[PDB]
Symmetry: C3
Subunit: 266 residues, 3 copies
Amino acid sequence: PLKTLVLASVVLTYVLMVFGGIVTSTGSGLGCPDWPLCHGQLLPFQLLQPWIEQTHRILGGITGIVLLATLFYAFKRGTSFVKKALVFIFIALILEALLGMRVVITEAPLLRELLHYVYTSAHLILSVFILSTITITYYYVKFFGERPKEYIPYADALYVATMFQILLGIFVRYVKALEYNQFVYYLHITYAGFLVILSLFIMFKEFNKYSLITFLLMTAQILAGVATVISGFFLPYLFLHIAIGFFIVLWVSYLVAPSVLKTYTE
Amino acid sequence: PLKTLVLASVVLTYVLMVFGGIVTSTGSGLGCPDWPLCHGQLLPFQLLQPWIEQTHRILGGITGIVLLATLFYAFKRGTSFVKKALVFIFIALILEALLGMRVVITEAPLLRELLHYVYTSAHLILSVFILSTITITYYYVKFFGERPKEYIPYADALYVATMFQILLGIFVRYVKALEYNQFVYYLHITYAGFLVILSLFIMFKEFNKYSLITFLLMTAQILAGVATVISGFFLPYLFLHIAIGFFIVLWVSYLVAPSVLKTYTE
Amino acid sequence: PLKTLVLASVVLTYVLMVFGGIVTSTGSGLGCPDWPLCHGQLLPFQLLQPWIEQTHRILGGITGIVLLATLFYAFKRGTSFVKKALVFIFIALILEALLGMRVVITEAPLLRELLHYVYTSAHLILSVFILSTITITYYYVKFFGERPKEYIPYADALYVATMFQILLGIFVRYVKALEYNQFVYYLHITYAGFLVILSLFIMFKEFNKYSLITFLLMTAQILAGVATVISGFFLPYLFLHIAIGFFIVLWVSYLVAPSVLKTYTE
Ligand SMILES: CCCCCCCC/C=C\CCCCCCCC(=O)O[C@@H](COC(=O)CCCCCCCCCCCCCCC)COP(=O)([O-])OCC[N+](C)(C)C
Ligand SMILES: CCCCCCCC/C=C\CCCCCCCC(=O)O[C@@H](COC(=O)CCCCCCCCCCCCCCC)COP(=O)([O-])OCC[N+](C)(C)C
Ligand SMILES: CCCCCCCC/C=C\CCCCCCCC(=O)O[C@@H](COC(=O)CCCCCCCCCCCCCCC)COP(=O)([O-])OCC[N+](C)(C)C
Ligand SMILES: CCCCCCCC/C=C\CCCCCCCC(=O)O[C@@H](COC(=O)CCCCCCCCCCCCCCC)COP(=O)([O-])OCC[N+](C)(C)C
Ligand SMILES: CCCCCCCC/C=C\CCCCCCCC(=O)O[C@@H](COC(=O)CCCCCCCCCCCCCCC)COP(=O)([O-])OCC[N+](C)(C)C
Ligand SMILES: CCCCCCCC/C=C\CCCCCCCC(=O)O[C@@H](COC(=O)CCCCCCCCCCCCCCC)COP(=O)([O-])OCC[N+](C)(C)C
Ligand SMILES: CCCCCCCC/C=C\CCCCCCCC(=O)O[C@@H](COC(=O)CCCCCCCCCCCCCCC)COP(=O)([O-])OCC[N+](C)(C)C
Ligand SMILES: CCCCCCCC/C=C\CCCCCCCC(=O)O[C@@H](COC(=O)CCCCCCCCCCCCCCC)COP(=O)([O-])OCC[N+](C)(C)C
Ligand SMILES: CCCCCCCC/C=C\CCCCCCCC(=O)O[C@@H](COC(=O)CCCCCCCCCCCCCCC)COP(=O)([O-])OCC[N+](C)(C)C
Ligand code: HEM
Ligand code: HEM
Ligand code: HEM
């Protein structure tokens, strides 16, 4: 029962994060006649269906329900790892809720804008942390008595590099400091090359289906990212990029889980 | 016979790549009286002997001949690794040939300039991939029955970091997006420090002749890079930098080969 | 007796480096009435108590004395590792002394300014190298007959990444090339995120007091760095940042020492 709950929570979390990145994609009012076929906002240095909103609310509610059910079942017939993982997920959720409470610290326009950037980026950072933790937990509930066979030669370094790239993408999306947004965009597009090189070396070190899928995911995300940039900010291209990025988060978490858990017991 | 062919192909590939980087160095017409003693083009943000051409053509022809001979001898009395390596080298060569065919995709000036940058950078990226693959193959044909003793403590991480630095250098050389060229130049000069730190730590972890040579190669390349920049773009300084960079590519490929091949059979 | 000398040299070196970064912090004349409560110089792109000086001189003299005593006792009843470490510390000290001798190479204003940046940055780089080497030596003199148990899962990668971040901070502090200073400042603040991610993954891989302390040190340094930037350059915030950064240097050196020394004898 716990395995089904954690798998459902992984799915719901991924779908909710992708959905939020699809409504929030230059959709504060989802303007233009082409709901999903109208260019989004360009990067600063380069310068309304009630259905989507109600289904976003429903998705948030249902994923909260399952996360609560998973938390309750973690302490019932669950190991210490699952309890700790859940606790870290719900601490992140509480942090997101507190970030929602935007009690005014200072009305200073500069520090106001910065704090707005901090809140917006921290929401996505906590979402990515929740997704990674729940994916590692989902791996943990499986293979519990099994011997944790590995999947790729360098999951750890790949995990860290991928998470840094995800952080760069979040900064590009939300940190609109203009000089820093341009810098972080150019660091993002360039570090994509490091990710490609690392995936190629991983595939060379041990070629299996997982290495090939990792390289193909990198290449599909890079291609998608470029496309999004090749022509304005087409919503469909911007979406596919978001979906592939969050699935890459999930994929690297799942690939890193066996390397870390191989040193555990049972 | 195969070992001699792969060694000759390694030499020819390195010499051809260096030569191309010596003619292409601000030598579209090789202007100025000092054929090799006249400053080259500065970076965008900072703003004709028939012999060389005919010997470049001869070198390209002879290296193509050997690569073809090596490909033919790979399938004759060769292992699967050598066949795959050759196939990946000739796929890269076919990709370079297709990049030579610059059928007009779009006349859009922006997307035209970008695609020009993509073609120019991809040629060098494929050249570096070919050099690395042929160096790993040359290591493979040697020590075939021998036990693959290691040379440096961290060849893999060193290989990945060095390849990322080479990619940065290629982007600086060819990607003239001005804002991005300045960014990538400053990322190149700064990541050189990371390479120096990594080489120093490698030398500390296990000091032998290979670690010392790696550190000295980094230091000679950094010094050369600075010199090239200290005074305009003197061709001799620009050349030595190119030669040392491509030899660093070869060196890190040769150093990484034993770490990856230690997990193979025979 | 050697262990006491190396521990004293570690302390003196850390305190002298921190002190120098506290006087040199926009204190060429230590102007403004608030000796330690007056904003320092902003970054270029963003635009006198005799006691402190005499105690800085006294601290330099006493730390030189101990370093000399440690060097003398290294060759007396000391192993080869300690002799080599001392020799590398005193070579760095001789290099610092030579950098003090600023014989005029070229009066070219550009190359003069660059060379000034090179001297100022190289002084701090040599100081950090001395601190790291003396911390590794202090670890070596302890546990000499003991089995070198590890402290954190990834000390090496953490050491290299931390040293690169320290290099970035030194460049931000001293390299005032304006376009490059802005770039390196934005690379510093962004690579702090990579350091946080790496520390989090380290803590996940093996949670103990050392992993928690490493993560807390990163987080305290990041917080301090931001504060320094949140409001001008308050001297107290600027100081705490310097002190935490140099202690992070010492901490990562101490954490990396057991991983490298585990492959040694005795
Ligand atoms: C967990 C793993 C990831 C960790 C990532 C840590 C990363 C830490 C990164 C460093 C953060 C601090 C950066 C420096 C602050 C001062 C910036 C200032 O100098 O402006 C600079 C820009 O720089 C800014 O644009 C950067 C903004 C980054 C926001 C990061 C949010 C992190 C949320 C963390 C959530 C943690 C989890 C949730 C909480 C538990 C200068 O540019 P400007 O302002 O444009 O200057 C002109 C302005 N003017 C035109 C108006 C005149
Ligand atoms: C700026 C510069 C940036 C770039 C710098 C360079 C960056 C890249 C640097 C790292 C790569 C360098 C590789 C050099 C040696 C290659 C040899 C290899 O091909 O043979 C090996 C193939 O197993 C894998 O190595 C094959 C995948 C290698 C990548 C090939 C291209 C990617 C597409 C791939 C997919 C499309 C393929 C389409 C064609 C079929 C031999 O293995 P095996 O003996 O057959 O099997 C036993 C070994 N095993 C037990 C572990 C499995
Ligand atoms: C943009 C998105 C791109 C997505 C790309 C996806 C690429 C995915 C590529 C494939 C990745 C998965 C490959 C799994 C292979 C496992 C093999 C091995 O581990 O055997 C294991 C099986 O494990 C399987 O049963 C797990 C199957 C999981 C399917 C996941 C589908 C993901 C869809 C993603 C959709 C994303 C959403 C898309 C729309 C938004 C072990 O099995 P066993 O040994 O038999 O154990 C029995 C032991 N016993 C007998 C004791 C009981
Ligand atoms: C294999 C290992 C290495 C992999 C590396 C992968 C790296 C992928 C990297 C990302 C590539 C895509 C980058 C973003 C595209 C849009 C850029 C646009 O925003 O312009 C931006 C610049 O940015 C550009 O200057 C960057 C150009 C990089 C070219 C890289 C070629 C890669 C070849 C791959 C070959 C693969 C092998 C061969 C094929 C199999 C903005 O700047 P601007 O344009 O100046 O704006 C003003 C313009 N104006 C003044 C005119 C108004
Ligand atoms: C922003 C800051 C950036 C910088 C941050 C720091 C970056 C650097 C951080 C990593 C280095 C930190 C080292 C600290 C400890 C040094 C101890 C070492 O010297 O002794 C060791 C020497 O073996 C090697 O360690 C010697 C090479 C070390 C580098 C010396 C400087 C480079 C020049 C070197 C060449 C010129 C030498 C010229 C003088 C002769 C002791 O080894 P052993 O016991 O004698 O032998 C047995 C061990 N063995 C079996 C493995 C072989
Ligand atoms: C800018 C360029 C800078 C270049 C810097 C170069 C620095 C180079 C520094 C030296 C690097 C090479 C050191 C090799 C040491 C090997 C030791 C060990 O492995 O023994 C091996 C020998 O292996 C040797 O035979 C290989 C010799 C290769 C020489 C390469 C010269 C490179 C020149 C580059 C010119 C570049 C072009 C320059 C002009 C453009 C094994 O031997 P064995 O054990 O006897 O095996 C017998 C087994 N059996 C008995 C069963 C049969
Ligand atoms: C050991 C581990 C760490 C190693 C780190 C190695 C790092 C090597 C890094 C590369 C160093 C060389 C950089 C390029 C040189 C040319 C720069 C030039 O293009 O200016 C560029 C800026 O770029 C500069 O601002 C960068 C300055 C970096 C100083 C680094 C000191 C290293 C000390 C090492 C001590 C070693 C130990 C002590 C000695 C044994 C362009 O910007 P600009 O100039 O502003 O242009 C306009 C100027 N104008 C407005 C006037 C018109
Ligand atoms: C752009 C995006 C950037 C971010 C991307 C993600 C970046 C981060 C990615 C890496 C972290 C991902 C972790 C996922 C799984 C977590 C499971 C873990 O909690 O349980 C484990 C706890 O042991 C440690 O793992 C606990 C520390 C984990 C970090 C928790 C937050 C940091 C605060 C922590 C301190 C405050 C805690 C406050 C609350 C108490 C279970 O271990 P155990 O079974 O109990 O013990 C046996 C195992 N042992 C023998 C090895 C010890
Ligand atoms: C901004 C600064 C932030 C500082 C944050 C500091 C955080 C520090 C957090 C704590 C870090 C230290 C934890 C050590 C735990 C060791 C446990 C284990 O190794 O046992 C070892 C003990 O080792 C101890 O005796 C060493 C004690 C060192 C104390 C260092 C204090 C640092 C203060 C920093 C002040 C900085 C300056 C601040 C002001 C400028 C082994 O012992 P044993 O097994 O009994 O061996 C006996 C064997 N026999 C019996 C055969 C003889
Ligand atoms: C290689 C060329 C790439 C380009 C041109 C590119 C482009 C972009 C752009 C323009 C954004 C801003 C999105 C917005 O403003 O709405 C973005 C965000 C992002 N990028 Fe990239 N990208 C590239 C590579 C990558 C890679 C390789 C990854 C991951 C492995 C990645 C992950 C992300 C993520 C996670 C985001 C944030 C999505 C969100 O916040 O919902 N990108 N990218
Ligand atoms: C440390 C200071 C460095 C400086 C100042 C520097 C400078 C430069 C410059 C200006 C270019 C552009 C060449 C051109 O336009 O023709 C370049 C290219 C390049 N650099 Fe650096 N560099 C440095 C370090 C390094 C290091 C450490 C490496 C490799 C380990 C490296 C590898 C390369 C490569 C491969 C190229 C491309 C050569 C080619 O395309 O033929 N550089 N460098
Ligand atoms: C995360 C946000 C950070 C910000 C906003 C920040 C800010 C700064 C600034 C403005 C300086 C210039 C100091 C000066 O001009 O006097 C500096 C220097 C420095 N930073 Fe950071 N920093 C951050 C993170 C870090 C981290 C994570 C580390 C190390 C792990 C670090 C280490 C250093 C060091 C060593 C210096 C040089 C101190 C000296 O030269 O005495 N910083 N930082």
